[PDB]
Each structure stands twice: as C-alpha cells, then as structure tokens.
C-alpha cells in the first residue's frame, strides 16, 4: 505494498502516498528545460517542519517521477513549473513515484570567485547532511554564480571547510567570514532519465 506506508527500496520505482492536508511539502527541488538539471526532478533539501519530513520516507537525492496525475518530465517543463508543483498546497494526500539511486547519481563541480568586501554572494542557504542547499538567490552579484549556480544546488565545502551536517550559525559565519578568495565545492543531482515526454 500500500502506497500510504510503502518502504522505499533502493533502485525500484515506488509509488507512494503522502499526507499533506493543506500544510507545506517543504522540499527544495531542481529540474527543468531551462534548468541546469535537465534529466529529472530531484529533492535537494527536506524542511524538518514540512509534510515530507512528517512522512519520514523521502531523503535527499530521491528522484521524483510522477506527482499526482503528472509525470515529471523536466525536459518539457519549466524550472518554474517543476518547483511550483511542490509549492502548491494540496488539500488531502499526494501520490508520487520515487526512485532512490544507490549509489546516488551526482555531478560535482567547483565555483571560484574573488568576493568584494560588503557585496554579498546573493545566496540563502539551508544546511543538511550533504551540505548547504541553495534556497534562493539574487542574480547579478557575481558573473560566476549566474552561469554556474542555481536554486537546489548543494554547497559541500567552503574555503576548505566541509559544510556537511553543520549548524546554520556555523555555516552563515563561514560565508560571512570571507572577503577575498572563494573556493566552493558543489554537489548536484544528475539522475538518469526515467521519464517520457507527453
């Protein structure tokens, strides 16, 4: 199995049903046709206060294939549409088809800049077991960020320090504690295609 309580076995598409009941899902997802991730929809952060967390099943890196009626083929959906399916408030329960890759399927790149003193990166971060997921960003701060980073990316390391499983106070102090050379290590989901187009 019943979707309401089905466990998530690795490497098997599982159809699940999640209690939402008008409360936010609270996930950060990536994927879209104009997106840096063009191969699927992937959870890069779970808010502890939201309904995904209250369900206890989904993890970071889970690949979302279908939401309700809609199969989530990001090749033919906007980044907006993708994100907005997860931020809608739904009245009852939501069905999802999920795939947990083991091992996980990721891209790993680097982003380097020379930050100017008192000119923010324009990033708002959410800390987790992988690193600091980017929750939102103001474009136009640093050319490097626009072309190489988007909402949903996970910053794994900042100027040498591993960001994995660190308190927000700690993360925020590290980022605000730099004015000069910036060396960011980044993990981004790259699922293999499990979706066909309409």
């Amino acid at each position: 199995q019943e979707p309401a309580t089905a466990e998530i076995k690795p490497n098997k598409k599982i159809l699940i049903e999640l209690k939402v009941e008008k409360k936010p899902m609270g996930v950060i997802v990536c994927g879209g046709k104009n997106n840096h991730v063009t191969t699927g929809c992937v959870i890069t952060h779970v808010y502890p206060e939201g309904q995904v967390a209250a369900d206890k099943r989904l993890k970071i890196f889970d690949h979302i294939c279908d939401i309700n009626g809609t199969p989530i083929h990001v090749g033919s959906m906007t980044t907006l549409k993708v994100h907005q399916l997860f931020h809608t408030t739904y009245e009852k329960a939501v069905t999802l088809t999920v795939f947990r890759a083991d091992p996980p399927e990721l891209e790993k790149f680097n982003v380097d800049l020379m930050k100017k003193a008192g000119k923010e990166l324009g990033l708002s971060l959410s800390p987790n077991e992988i690193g600091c997921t980017i929750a939102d960003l103001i474009q136009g701060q640093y050319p490097e960020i626009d072309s190489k980073l988007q909402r949903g990316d996970i910053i794994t390391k900042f100027n040498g320090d591993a960001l994995e499983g660190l308190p927000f106070q700690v993360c925020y102090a590290l980022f605000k504690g730099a004015n000069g050379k910036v060396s960011m290590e980044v993990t981004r989901p790259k699922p293999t295609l499990r979706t066909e187009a309409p």
């Binding site: 923010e120 990166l121 324009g122 990033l123 708002s124 971060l125 929750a135 939102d136 103001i138 927000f168 925020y172 980022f175 605000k176």
Partner: peptide, 9 residues
C-alpha cells in the same frame, strides 16, 4: 544579512 524574512550570505 536579514532582508524580507531570509538570511543572506
């Protein structure tokens, strides 16, 4: 900073 309810770096 804190601006419109969020923390920015």
């Amino acid at each position: 900073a804190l601006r419109n309810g969020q923390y920015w770096v």
